[PDB]
Amino acid sequence: GMQKPHLLITSAGRRAKLVEYFVKEFKTGRVSTADCSPLASALYMADQHYIVPKIDEVEYIDHLLTLCQDEGVTALLTLIDPELGLLAQATERFQAIGVTVIVSPYAACELCFDKYTMYEYCLRQGIAHARTYATMASFEEALAAGEVQLPVFVKPRNGDLIVQELLVGQELGVDAYVDLISGKVTSIFIKEKLTMRAGETDKSRSVLRDDVFELVEHVLDGSGLVGPLDFDLFDVAGTLYLSEINPRFGGGYPHAYECGVNFPAQLYRNLMHEINVPQIGQYLDDIYMLKHDTVTLISAAELQKIKR
Amino acid sequence: GMQKPHLLITSAGRRAKLVEYFVKEFKTGRVSTADCSPLASALYMADQHYIVPKIDEVEYIDHLLTLCQDEGVTALLTLIDPELGLLAQATERFQAIGVTVIVSPYAACELCFDKYTMYEYCLRQGIAHARTYATMASFEEALAAGEVQLPVFVKPRNGDLIVQELLVGQELGVDAYVDLISGKVTSIFIKEKLTMRAGETDKSRSVLRDDVFELVEHVLDGSGLVGPLDFDLFDVAGTLYLSEINPRFGGGYPHAYECGVNFPAQLYRNLMHEINVPQIGQYLDDIYMLKHDTVTLISAAELQKIKR
Incomplete structure (x- = not known):
């Protein structure tokens, strides 16, 4: 609706806390989730969750377009790297049904x-x-x-x-948001990755560094990258090395969120046609994030209430 | 105190949800935590948390005895395998200060x-x-x-x-509790391990199987194993293979807890001198557990309020 976006988060997988952030920040409208497995924990953080094909299956995009029309989806975002290009390539098909794909x-x-x-x-x-x-x-x-x-x-x-x-050297995980309307970088959150767990940042410390802010700004300036972004960097003897640019939410995003750097709220505002005011480096340094497992229980019968 | 146990959970590490369960079930008294690192997330799930030496340091037990006396600790439990034998060997020293070490x-x-x-x-x-x-x-x-x-x-x-x-074959993670007073097995919770993450059960399905109950009962009968226990099994073509016995809480214990199999409450009752009534297999099968990361933020200044 005019005042009510319906964001579909695909390949939600294990990103339960991120979906929770979206549910909280979508003050009007709806946030729904999709994944190929009913065992994806993030599915159950939204009211409506759907089982879709695997991203490499031929009919994946056909299925997403049909799901979008059937469920009144207004916008789409993926949480995984391999789906980014797939959705980017299909943007015109989503535009042909009125759906905005939030991808660079x-x-x-x-x-x-x-x-x-x-x-x-x-x-x-x-x-x-x-x-x-x-x-x-x-x-x-x-x-x-x-x-x-x-x-x-x-x-x-x-x-x-x-x-x-x-x-x-010291590995740095930088969360960045480029406003979907203005095309300007509105927020950059830098954390030192202290401990890794299953390929994700498990423990981290927030930092304020002019060199990282300037490097990220320079890289994003004229890139065309939009929305939530993740940069992997390495400080090696005082020199910043760029390791990865992942055009999607980084696994350490909850650190940024809890420190007040709110991409889901900015995304919500952008879908409500509001430009976000840039506020780079307006968070506290020396704040540590420590992840820990919580749990969701679901019966097989309740699991069976979707599965297509 | 007479009505108030003070349980110290050592090597708490990342077992935040387990400590939360203990805090909830200790209806009288106190649950405190200890670890060698201030970056152990489980530390902050209890009101009082302490930094102790690493378990392999010579002065570890000396330090625990002094901490116990200084903080009025009445009972001690570890969450890691390498500390079990260390505390078991030192039980008489803890008994000499009035402290009950909850270890086999x-x-x-x-x-x-x-x-x-x-x-x-x-x-x-x-x-x-x-x-x-x-x-x-x-x-x-x-x-x-x-x-x-x-x-x-x-x-x-x-x-x-x-x-x-x-x-x-199908890997099975069995949580078991042997009553500290009666020496009888009071609860056994069986889950199929579906997905592993960083060496722990990340996704699982509860099951009711007479063969597993009988195998675990037979193994525990006359073993001398007490308190919370973990068995790793494999169903290989209908035959149960025993892979591990870990005399401590298994990483999949939250599945048991959420299904009503409450070891922390039973432990609390045992420290309150109550025998737990055996209730084996009184839970629902076909209930899935899906772990997902949540977060704790702590400033460096707040982290610095302990660190010895």
């Missing part, structure tokens, strides 16, 4: 998704980044020339492999 | 902690268990005789290594 442009999503293209972007822009190799020959050459040392990370190329320089 | 006897803790001695126990008792080898020669012999196949798990011996038969 396709080319930007794909540039960020492929670790090698991301590296090439950094080299062009003058942004520090771990030396990265897409072929075995170039890695051997680099070892031969002393350009890279013995200990190394071998990662998959997307998210074919890549080998890259082992960066030893 | 030392020999039992050590038999359960060492994977090889646990295997030998099973062989003696007729309990199915994965073929396990403490030497490289015996593993080669077993491969030579066709007693073990190509794919294998290599685990550390405690919690020197061991190699053992790769069990392929």
Whole structure:
């Protein structure tokens, strides 16, 4: 409705706390969730939850378009990297049914998704980044020339492999929001990643650093990246290395939220056609986030009340 | 006090939900926490939390005894395997200051902690268990005789290594409580482990199975194991294999709690000198548990209000 957005959060998975934040901040309208598994905990943080195909299934987008029309969805957001480009590529189909896909442009999503293209972007822009190799020959050459040392990370190329320089330093997880109307960066939240758990930031400390703010602003300036964003950085002997740009909410976003940096409220305001006023660095440093498991119980019968 | 126990939970770590359960069920008295790191989330679920030495430091027990006397602690419980034997061995020192250590006897803790001695126990008792080898020669012999196949798990011996038969089947996490006064098993909660996350049960389904109840009862009968316990089992083609006995709360305990199987209340009752009435299998099957992260924020100044 005119005053009531209906946000569908797809690939909700385990991001229960994030969906809770959205439910709380959508003061009018509705927040619904979708995932391919009924065992995704985040599904049950919203009133309406739907089982959809897996993102790699051919009929995924066809199904989302039909779900959107049937359930009066006005906007769509994914929480996972592999779905970003898929939704970006399909934006015109969603626009043809009146649905706004909250995703950065396709080319930007794909540039960020492929670790090698991301590296090439950094080299062009003058942004520090771990030396990265897409072929075995170039890695051997680099070892031969002393350009890279013995200990190394071998990662998959997307998210074919890549080998890259082992960066030893303080890892930083930066949450950033680019206003969907004005195109300006409105908030940046920087945390030191202290402890990792199952590939996510489990413990962290908020920090205020002009260098990180300036680096992120410079990178976002003219990028075309919009909405909630995540930057992975490394402070290595006082120099900031860009490791990843993930055009979606970072797993450490709850730190930002609890410190007053509210992307779901800004997103809600943008769907209500309001521009958010930029307020960069208006949070407290030296605030620690410590994650811990809580639980949701659901009976098989209650689980069976959806499953298509 | 006579009506007021003071339970200290050591090595609280990340078990925030479990400490919350204890705070709720200790209707009189107090529940406090301890850990070696101020970044242990479970610390802040209790009113009084203390930083103690690491469990392997020589002065650990000396420090716990002094903390207990200074803070009027009446009972002590650990949440980690490596501390069980340490506290069991020191029980008389705690008894000399009037403190009840809630731990199974030392020999039992050590038999359960060492994977090889646990295997030998099973062989003696007729309990199915994965073929396990403490030497490289015996593993080669077993491969030579066709007693073990190509794919294998290599685990550390405690919690020197061991190699053992790769069990392929439905993994079961059984929570069990043995009454501290009567010595009888009062509750057994069985869940199928569906998904693992960082070595813990993340998703599970409650089940009612006579075979598991009987196996656990038979194992506990005359064992000397007391208080909260955790059994790791595998259903492999209809046969139950015993994988682990961990004489402490299992990581999937919140499933049991939320289904009405309340060990913290039973523990509280035992410290209030009440025997718990056995009520085995009085819960609903087909109830799924789905864990998800919540958060605790703490400032560095607030963190600094303890740290010894």
